[PDB]
Amino acid sequence: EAPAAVVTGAAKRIGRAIAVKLHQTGYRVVIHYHNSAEAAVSLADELNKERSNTAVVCQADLTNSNVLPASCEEIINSCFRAFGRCDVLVNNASAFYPTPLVGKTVETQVAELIGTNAIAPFLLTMSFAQRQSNLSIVNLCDAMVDQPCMAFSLYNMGKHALVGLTQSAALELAPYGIRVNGVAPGVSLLPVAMGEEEKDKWRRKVPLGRREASAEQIADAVIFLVSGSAQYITGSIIKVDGGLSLVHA
Amino acid sequence: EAPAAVVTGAAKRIGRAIAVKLHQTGYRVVIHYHNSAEAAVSLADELNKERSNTAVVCQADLTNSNVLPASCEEIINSCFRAFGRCDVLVNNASAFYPTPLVQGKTVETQVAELIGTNAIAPFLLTMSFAQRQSNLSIVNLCDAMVDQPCMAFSLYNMGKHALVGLTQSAALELAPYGIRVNGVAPGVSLLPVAMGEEEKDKWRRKVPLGRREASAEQIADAVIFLVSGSAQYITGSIIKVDGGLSLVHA
Amino acid sequence: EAPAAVVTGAAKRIGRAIAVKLHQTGYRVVIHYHNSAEAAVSLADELNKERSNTAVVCQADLTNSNVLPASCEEIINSCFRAFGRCDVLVNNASAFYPTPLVGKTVETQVAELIGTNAIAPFLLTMSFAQRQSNLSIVNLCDAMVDQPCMAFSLYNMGKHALVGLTQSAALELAPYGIRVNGVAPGVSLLPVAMGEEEKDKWRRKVPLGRREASAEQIADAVIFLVSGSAQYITGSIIKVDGGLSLVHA
Amino acid sequence: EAPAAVVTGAAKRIGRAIAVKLHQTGYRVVIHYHNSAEAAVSLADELNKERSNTAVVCQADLTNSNVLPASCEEIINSCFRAFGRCDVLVNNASAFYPTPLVQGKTVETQVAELIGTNAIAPFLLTMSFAQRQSSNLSIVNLCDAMVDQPCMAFSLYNMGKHALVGLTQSAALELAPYGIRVNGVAPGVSLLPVAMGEEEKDKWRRKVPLGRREASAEQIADAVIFLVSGSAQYITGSIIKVDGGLSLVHA
Numbered sequence: 001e002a003p004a005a006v007v008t009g010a011a012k013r014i015g016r017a018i019a020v021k022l023h024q025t026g027y028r029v030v031i032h033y034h035n036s037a038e039a040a041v042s043l044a045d046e047l048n049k050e051r052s053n054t055a056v057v058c059q060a061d062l063t064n065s066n067v068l069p070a071s072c073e074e075i076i077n078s079c080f081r082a083f084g085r086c087d088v089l090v091n092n093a094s095a096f097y098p099t100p101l102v103g104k105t106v107e108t109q110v111a112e113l114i115g116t117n118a119i120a121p122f123l124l125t126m127s128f129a130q131r132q133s134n135l136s137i138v139n140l141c142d143a144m145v146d147q148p149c150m151a152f153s154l155y156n157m158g159k160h161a162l163v164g165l166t167q168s169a170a171l172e173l174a175p176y177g178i179r180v181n182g183v184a185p186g187v188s189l190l191p192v193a194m195g196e197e198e199k200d201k202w203r204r205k206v207p208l209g210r211r212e213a214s215a216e217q218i219a220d221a222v223i224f225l226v227s228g229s230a231q232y233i234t235g236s237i238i239k240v241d242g243g244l245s246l247v248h249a
Numbered sequence: 250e251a252p253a254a255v256v257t258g259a260a261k262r263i264g265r266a267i268a269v270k271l272h273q274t275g276y277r278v279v280i281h282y283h284n285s286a287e288a289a290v291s292l293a294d295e296l297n298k299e300r301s302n303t304a305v306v307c308q309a310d311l312t313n314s315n316v317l318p319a320s321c322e323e324i325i326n327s328c329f330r331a332f333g334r335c336d337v338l339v340n341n342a343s344a345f346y347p348t349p350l351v352q353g354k355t356v357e358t359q360v361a362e363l364i365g366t367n368a369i370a371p372f373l374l375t376m377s378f379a380q381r382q383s384n385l386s387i388v389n390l391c392d393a394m395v396d397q398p399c400m401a402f403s404l405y406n407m408g409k410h411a412l413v414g415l416t417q418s419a420a421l422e423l424a425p426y427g428i429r430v431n432g433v434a435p436g437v438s439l440l441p442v443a444m445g446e447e448e449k450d451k452w453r454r455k456v457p458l459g460r461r462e463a464s465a466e467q468i469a470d471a472v473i474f475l476v477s478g479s480a481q482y483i484t485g486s487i488i489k490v491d492g493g494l495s496l497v498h499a
Numbered sequence: 500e501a502p503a504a505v506v507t508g509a510a511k512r513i514g515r516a517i518a519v520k521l522h523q524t525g526y527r528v529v530i531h532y533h534n535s536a537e538a539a540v541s542l543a544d545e546l547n548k549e550r551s552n553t554a555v556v557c558q559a560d561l562t563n564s565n566v567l568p569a570s571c572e573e574i575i576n577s578c579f580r581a582f583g584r585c586d587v588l589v590n591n592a593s594a595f596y597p598t599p600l601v602g603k604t605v606e607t608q609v610a611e612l613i614g615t616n617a618i619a620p621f622l623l624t625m626s627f628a629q630r631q632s633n634l635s636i637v638n639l640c641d642a643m644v645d646q647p648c649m650a651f652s653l654y655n656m657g658k659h660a661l662v663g664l665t666q667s668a669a670l671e672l673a674p675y676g677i678r679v680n681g682v683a684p685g686v687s688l689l690p691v692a693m694g695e696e697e698k699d700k701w702r703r704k705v706p707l708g709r710r711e712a713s714a715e716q717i718a719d720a721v722i723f724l725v726s727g728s729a730q731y732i733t734g735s736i737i738k739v740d741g742g743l744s745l746v747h748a
Numbered sequence: 749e750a751p752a753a754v755v756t757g758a759a760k761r762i763g764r765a766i767a768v769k770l771h772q773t774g775y776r777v778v779i780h781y782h783n784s785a786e787a788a789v790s791l792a793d794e795l796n797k798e799r800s801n802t803a804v805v806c807q808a809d810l811t812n813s814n815v816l817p818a819s820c821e822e823i824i825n826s827c828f829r830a831f832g833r834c835d836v837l838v839n840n841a842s843a844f845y846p847t848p849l850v851q852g853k854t855v856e857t858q859v860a861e862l863i864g865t866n867a868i869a870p871f872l873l874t875m876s877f878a879q880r881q882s883s884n885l886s887i888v889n890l891c892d893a894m895v896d897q898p899c900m901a902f903s904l905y906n907m908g909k910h911a912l913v914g915l916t917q918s919a920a921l922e923l924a925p926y927g928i929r930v931n932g933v934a935p936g937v938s939l940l941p942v943a944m945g946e947e948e949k950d951k952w953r954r955k956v957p958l959g960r961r962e963a964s965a966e967q968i969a970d971a972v973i974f975l976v977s978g979s980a981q982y983i984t985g986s987i988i989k990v991d992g993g994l995s996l997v998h999a
């Protein structure tokens with residue numbers, strides 16, 4: 001039988017590209033989404049047209065709260081419900097916006113940025129492990145975590161936390177044969193919305209090709225880490241950044 | 250006149266050594282605490298006996314919740330209320346206990362305590378500290394073993410990682426306001442009194458420098474340096490004080 | 500045309516697996532060796548048996564000296580002369596032995612350890628860049644670089660310098676389309692001079708499976724990095740260590 | 749009696765600032781130098797004017813070669829010769845210049861100077877320091893806060909500084925049982941070259957979050973002094989950035 005993967009924030013962009021690739025590799029997929037319901041259903045339709053009964057959606061808010069654990073347990077349950085097994089968890093969903101030190105309340109900023117980037121990945125990881133072949137987890141990290149954007153402190157703390165989870169969980173889950181790794185984009189898939197001037201300025205920063213990563217290039221590193229070619233790899237985070245993190249100010 | 254400092258978790262152990270040293274250097278101090286009310290009150294008394302009205306206490310749970318932003322703002326407000334200024338913030342308070350990924354606190358409470366105390370409260374205190382504003386600085390108590398974590402301590406470790414991120418992000422963001430932000434990262438310091446000596450010696454044996462743990466005072470020494478005029482160009486730096494422990498392979 | 504690769508220290512062990520696996524993937528290979536002449540030549544025979552005119556040998560000492568630049572230049576030249584092109588360089592050759600701070604002279608130890616692990620990599624990189632598709636370099640690093648073996652200061656210095664090179668060369672060669680990455684093993688192929696209690700000691704520290712990596716698992720990561728699935732990856736070092744680097748003392 | 753320190757490359761700039769501050773704190777100093785003879789002798793002169801028989805100069809090339817081990821042994825021997833003891837070693841001397849991968853110094857010579865001064869000489873001086881030994885023995889290596897965002901075409905320089913990080917770590921671990929601490933100070937930008945144009949200096953200064961200015965020599969020396977002092981007795985294997993936040997800035 002075919003393996004199954006949960007991908008969070010899989011309706012659009014990088015998450016969708018990862019889902020599409022996992023599916024092309026032979027995986028059945030849970031497409032988790034929060035607000036992008038239409039895109040998610042559309043993607044599941046498209047994947048099931050390709051191989052019937054190989055994709056479902058699963059809606060969940062991944063903001064921190066007292067029910068987040070139940071919500072993460074339900075995401076993993078939903079993969080067992082639809083496919084009888086859960087082989088891969090990809091923690092991709094992420095809030096991202098500035099939170100300067102000097103609309104939203106601070107308690108809400110905390111709950112969204114730390115919840116999505118750190119606490120949900122930990123809770124999904126617990127639920128993944130508890131419900132348990134080549135088992136692994138891939139956390140979408142950030143290659144720029146040690147050269148942070150101005151006024152992104154909560155976002156940065158969450159991606160830092162996610163590094164620590166990758167390491168702690170690689171360590172603790174190894175005795176169960178579950179590998180835990182990360183993929184760290186630099187800049188990838190610019191908002192088609194974003195001004196051409198700013199897009200170009202980001203592109204000019206990148207040593208390798210003066211362009212952003214495609215979503216597919218990020219997906220490719222995910223595919224490697226979950227593959228049989230990465231069986232001895234745990235606790236490793238792979239930058240997919242074209243050298244961006246290496247460039248001095 | 251004399252500068253002022255807030256030290257969180259300042260009633261006992263490393264926080265207390267930090268407050269005392271800062272006090273000895275001429276600072277007035279806010280001794281924050283949570284449960285150790287007797288220790289905090291006797292510490293303030295000892296210090297005020299030494300110099301009049303140079304120490305006050307401030308109780309607050311730093312678990313993450315909807316009220317944490319107000320509690321943190323009140324901590325900084327207590328410094329201005331007591332002393333008319335707030336020059337230094339030392340984020341030392343920390344919940345520490347295992348949270349296994351696989352098997353009576355609920356996990357959402359463990360999350361709130363471990364990520365609140367170690368990361369979120371630091372961020373909120375930093376916000377209030379900066380908002381309320383010379384040698385201004387913040388020192389965050391980190392952990393030298395953060396990239397070789399203890400088994401079954403994922404939330405604690407996540408909290409300490411997040412705190413490294415905060416140190417960096419805040420150093421960058423507050424640099425234009427002349428606030429430096431640095432870290433001190435102990436390895437093993439002041440082992441629990443309750444821990445058998447024979448258990449303490451298994452930690453001691455791992456330390457290359459002297460086969461022993463750090464004193465509370467040695468940790469405080471790094472804090473005093475970071476807050477001094479000898480460190481005026483230092484920001485975003487995390488100084489390990491671990492006697493080589495983090496260098497030792499398994 | 501089939502692409503071509505140079506693997507240093509390729510007669511035995513991990514270099515051999517890398518050569519074999521590159522060859523299996525379609526590459527023509529230069530098998531560099533220092534003292535293992537008989538194994539290099541039988542490896543070449545075996546690969547040419549499989550596909551004719553796809554493997555040659557090149558002997559060189561990679562110790563640091565006044566002639567090291569010309570040696571490295573001639574290694575790269577072997578590949579151009581045999582195969583008309585050089586697409587991949589793998590810097591795998593490495594001296595490794597204790598050099599206590601408190602037999603060989605210390606200057607010899609410096610030359611061997613720093614030469615094999617860093618300066619030869621640097622010169623080979625220069626020669627490779629200068630002679631110039633999917634071009635890349637893969638440096639064999641060490642996952643335990645920040646928790647070094649006692650009394651191994653020069654080896655560790657050399658491996659640190661190799662991280663340095665990986666990073667600097669990634670930045671500098673990105674404009675030419677040359678990627679530069681690293682693979683950092685933990686423990687792999689324990690020596691035979693090693694006792695049973697000693698090997699068991701190492702194996703027991705490895706979280707993922709309580710075992711060393713196979714040479715093939717290390718090679719899997721090299722193949723990935725040189726592949727089209729790593730087109731956006733430069734300056735990245737992938738640990739392949741079963742989580743050994745994460746284990747506190 | 750007064751402790752003694754060796755400072756490599758101490759005739760001017762950061763090394764002089766370090767030697768000056770150790771001396772003021774009470775140390776006897778070996779001022780090592782390579783080309784700057786006049787500057788070194790003149791510094792020793794001042795320091796001796798301040799306290800008699802507390803400074804000496806010591807000439808050595810720290811380019812890698814087969815005699816470098818003897819040269820490093822002689823540097824340390826010179827401390828014992830003049831002062832009867834050697835408590836502190838500061839590895840400050842450093843060659844710095846580009847070595848582009850793609851294209852009148854030969855590459856041999858580039859490898860020798862950059863890797864010699866930044867790494868191999870520090871290793872050999874550390875060996876000789878430990879070998880020649882209530883004390884406070886330590887080593888401070890001058891590292892580089894930008895070691896993971898290297899300058900274009902500085903590969904040999906960067907390799908050398910990376911190797912120095914490794915030495916700092918390896919030596920801390922190995923020399924701990926002897927009571928010898930080993931730490932690093934990692935400047936960002938400090939003391940801009942003399943002839944650099946106002947335009948270029950401005951561009952560097954504007955990159956620094958804390959104050960938009962390079963570090964003073966004294967600022968770097970402050971961190972060295974901290975690490976050698978009794979306030980750092982449990983500190984080993986640590987590298988303190990003194991960079992005004994520079995290393996945290998993305999491009």
Ligand SMILES: NC(=O)c1ccc[n+]([C@@H]2O[C@H](COP(=O)([O-])OP(=O)(O)OC[C@H]3O[C@@H](n4cnc5c(N)ncnc54)[C@H](OP(=O)(O)O)[C@@H]3O)[C@@H](O)[C@H]2O)c1
Nearest residue numbers: 009013014033034035036061062063092093094140187188
């Ligand atoms: N793009 C880059 O340049 C870049 C750079 C560095 C790191 N990364 C990392 O790579 C991953 C993917 O990047 P991206 O640009 O594709 O991400 P994104 O578009 O910013 O976010 C992906 C998805 O996250 C989900 N999400 C946001 N808040 C959520 C909440 N409270 N609960 C549940 N789901 C939530 C959203 O789902 P709905 O749309 O369904 O609401 C969104 O579509 C992220 O982890 C990101 O941090 C990306």
Ligand SMILES: NC(=O)c1ccc[n+]([C@@H]2O[C@H](COP(=O)([O-])OP(=O)(O)OC[C@H]3O[C@@H](n4cnc5c(N)ncnc54)[C@H](OP(=O)(O)O)[C@@H]3O)[C@@H](O)[C@H]2O)c1
Nearest residue numbers: 258262263282283284285310311341342343390436437438
């Ligand atoms: N000790 C070590 O070996 C070591 C190693 C690595 C890092 N560190 C770091 O150095 C710092 C000091 O270490 P330590 O061993 O002195 O710390 P600790 O004794 O474990 O805890 C410090 C104080 O934190 C306060 N605290 C705990 N939970 C709290 C909560 N929910 N709300 C508010 N305050 C709370 C407590 O106050 P009350 O007692 O008033 O309740 C406690 O006395 C910590 O940040 C620690 O993580 C220490």
Ligand SMILES: NC(=O)c1ccc[n+]([C@@H]2O[C@H](COP(=O)([O-])OP(=O)(O)OC[C@H]3O[C@@H](n4cnc5c(N)ncnc54)[C@H](OP(=O)(O)O)[C@@H]3O)[C@@H](O)[C@H]2O)c1
Nearest residue numbers: 508512513532533534535560561591592593594639686687
């Ligand atoms: N094995 C591990 O657990 C481990 C762990 C960390 C890192 N690594 C790294 O992964 C790579 C492969 O490891 P390995 O154990 O397969 O390596 P290895 O057997 O120790 O050495 C590989 C080859 O290096 C060559 N070599 C040594 N000194 C040389 C010199 N002076 N000139 C030219 N060549 C020289 C030798 O070639 P000849 O046989 O032809 O003389 C040897 O076969 C190395 O870069 C190593 O540092 C390995």
Ligand SMILES: NC(=O)c1ccc[n+]([C@@H]2O[C@H](COP(=O)([O-])OP(=O)(O)OC[C@H]3O[C@@H](n4cnc5c(N)ncnc54)[C@H](OP(=O)(O)O)[C@@H]3O)[C@@H](O)[C@H]2O)c1
Nearest residue numbers: 757761762781782783784809810811840841842890937938
């Ligand atoms: N300046 C900065 O912004 C900065 C930034 C990062 C790191 N650092 C580090 O901080 C330290 C001091 O920096 P700096 O700018 O003061 O250093 P520097 O002026 O570039 O060099 C200091 C001394 O090193 C000696 N030196 C050079 N080549 C030598 C050789 N072959 N043999 C022996 N000595 C040699 C020279 O001595 P003579 O003059 O006697 O010949 C020179 O005066 C260095 O280790 C440097 O890498 C500095």
Ligand SMILES: Nc1nc(NC2CCCCC2)c2c(-c3ccc(F)cc3)c[nH]c2n1
Nearest residue numbers: 093094095096142186187188189190191202
């Ligand atoms: N979850 C998440 N999303 C990101 N970008 C998303 C782009 C679409 C709208 C939501 C934000 C980034 C970026 C990002 C990189 C370059 C850029 F020009 C803009 C944003 C860095 N980390 C990130 N994490």
Ligand SMILES: Nc1nc(NC2CCCCC2)c2c(-c3ccc(F)cc3)c[nH]c2n1
Nearest residue numbers: 342343344345392436437438439440441452
């Ligand atoms: N907030 C906090 N507290 C810690 N230890 C405290 C010791 C007294 C009882 C509460 C725990 C550690 C330790 C710690 C190190 C060695 C040891 F044997 C036990 C605990 C590592 N980080 C820490 N953070």
Ligand SMILES: Nc1nc(NC2CCCCC2)c2c(-c3ccc(F)cc3)c[nH]c2n1
Nearest residue numbers: 592593594595641685686687688689690701
């Ligand atoms: N070039 C090279 N060779 C290595 N091992 C080789 C083993 C065969 C004999 C030559 C040395 C190591 C090791 C190595 C790891 C675990 C172990 F138990 C023994 C040696 C770490 N880096 C290394 N680099």
Ligand SMILES: Nc1nc(NC2CCCCC2)c2c(-c3ccc(F)cc3)c[nH]c2n1
Nearest residue numbers: 841842843844892937938939940941942952
């Ligand atoms: N030994 C050494 N020297 C350095 N600078 C010196 C400036 C005076 C003349 C020799 C070079 C640097 C610098 C340096 C920083 C900024 C700048 F604008 C120029 C050089 C970085 N590491 C270094 N190591």
